[PDB]
Design an enzyme around this catalytic site. Structure first.
Site, mmCIF file in Angstrom:
data_model
loop_
_atom_site.group_PDB
_atom_site.id
_atom_site.type_symbol
_atom_site.label_atom_id
_atom_site.label_comp_id
_atom_site.label_asym_id
_atom_site.label_seq_id
_atom_site.Cartn_x
_atom_site.Cartn_y
_atom_site.Cartn_z
ATOM 1 N N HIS A 43 0.795 -1.234 0.000
ATOM 2 C CA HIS A 43 0.000 0.000 0.000
ATOM 3 C C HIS A 43 0.827 1.284 0.000
ATOM 4 C CE1 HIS A 43 0.329 -0.132 4.530
ATOM 5 N NE2 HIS A 43 0.489 1.156 4.318
ATOM 6 N N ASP A 99 -0.442 -7.551 1.937
ATOM 7 C CA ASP A 99 0.101 -6.204 1.802
ATOM 8 C C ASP A 99 1.645 -6.292 1.793
ATOM 9 O OD1 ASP A 99 0.221 -3.418 1.778
ATOM 10 O OD2 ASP A 99 -0.322 -3.195 3.875
ATOM 11 N N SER A 197 4.168 2.705 8.193
ATOM 12 C CA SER A 197 3.853 1.684 7.180
ATOM 13 C C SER A 197 5.074 1.205 6.426
ATOM 14 C CB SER A 197 2.890 2.244 6.129
ATOM 15 O OG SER A 197 1.588 2.310 6.559
#
Lengths: 249, 17, 27
Positions: A43, A99, A197
């Protein structure tokens, strides 16, 4: 990172910063797994709901950093991407399932006291270490609260039992994710947060003393909220895809 | 949901690229 | 090959300030 502390110099030599060329902004964390391969969350590169779809040329990889903003002369190295590989079954539409993404560097990076790869787990290591109660370590330059730190932050968090992870959210969780954090009464706090992230969740093997990357900072709802947990991509569950890419390319 | 800030950075010298 | 062994810690037999907390949790 919420409720973490400044990292010591060289404490996380595999830590990588995903940097946008223009505007110059920190996009995500990432990790060095070899002289020319970087692992991150899919992502960080592709997320249609937010109109995110980065190509190799839009990014820079900075390795060996400690300070978030400063250009660390003679310490950090910058590399450009030759190719990006997103998991073909990465589910951005629903729950960020799978992911994960690999990024091949233009030229191999030279290791130093501040730049060194992390190990990817094998079935045995994954089995013995991925258990509720065992603590891993997350690092990143993301939000300190639900502003940003001056240097790399670190926080150690315990892996949570799957039932507890499921019952804490409305999101459908899969076998490709695991959650971590302290429960409301445990007395301790801490979490990853936006900006973290793609960063590594690592554990030090007590068998051979090596650091292994078990997870990738993926998602959460808020940061450090009571009764809520951070979710990470299960690296071992996707290792077959990792090897396949590295072997083919 | 998924994990820049913008607390501005020091320019990267061309010789580093 | 030399993965996961940090030049400033494992390679010098020096440990960081909180790694013990991790090992102590691997009961």
């Amino acid at each position: 990172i919420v409720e973490g502390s400044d990292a010591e110099i060289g404490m996380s030599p595999w830590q990588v910063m995903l940097f946008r060329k223009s505007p110059q902004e920190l996009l995500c964390g990432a990790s060095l797994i070899s002289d020319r391969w970087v692992l991150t969350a899919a992502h960080c590169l592709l997320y249609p709901p937010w109109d995110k779809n980065f190509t190799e040329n839009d990014l820079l990889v900075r390795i060996g950093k400690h300070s978030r903003t400063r250009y660390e002369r003679n310490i950090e190295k910058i590399s450009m991407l030759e190719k990006i590989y997103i998991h073909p079954r990465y589910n951005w539409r629903e729950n960020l399932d799978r992911d994960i993404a690999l990024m091949k560097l233009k030229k191999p990076v030279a290791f130093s006291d501040y730049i060194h790869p992390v190990c990817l787990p094998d079935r045995e290591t994954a089995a013995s270490l991925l258990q509720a109660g065992y603590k891993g370590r997350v690092t990143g330059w993301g939000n300190l609260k639900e502003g940003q730190p001056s240097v790399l932050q670190v926080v150690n968090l315990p892996i949570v039992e799957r039932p507890v992870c499921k019952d804490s959210t409305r999101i459908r969780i899969t076998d490709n994710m695991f959650c971590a954090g302290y429960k409301p009464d445990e007395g301790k706090r801490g979490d990853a947060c936006e900006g973290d992230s793609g960063g590594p969740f690592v554990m030090k093997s007590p068998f051979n003393n090596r650091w292994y990357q078990m997870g990738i900072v993926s998602w959460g709802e808020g940061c450090d909220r009571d009764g809520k947990y951070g979710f990470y991509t299960h690296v071992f569950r996707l290792k077959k895809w990792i090897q396949k890419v590295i072997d083919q390319f | 949901x998924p994990x820049g800030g913008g607390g501005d950075y020091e320019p990267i010298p061309e010789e580093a690229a | 090959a030399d993965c996961g062994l940090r030049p400033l810690f494992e390679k010098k037999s020096l440990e960081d300030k909180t790694e013990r907390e991790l090992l102590e949790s691997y009961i």
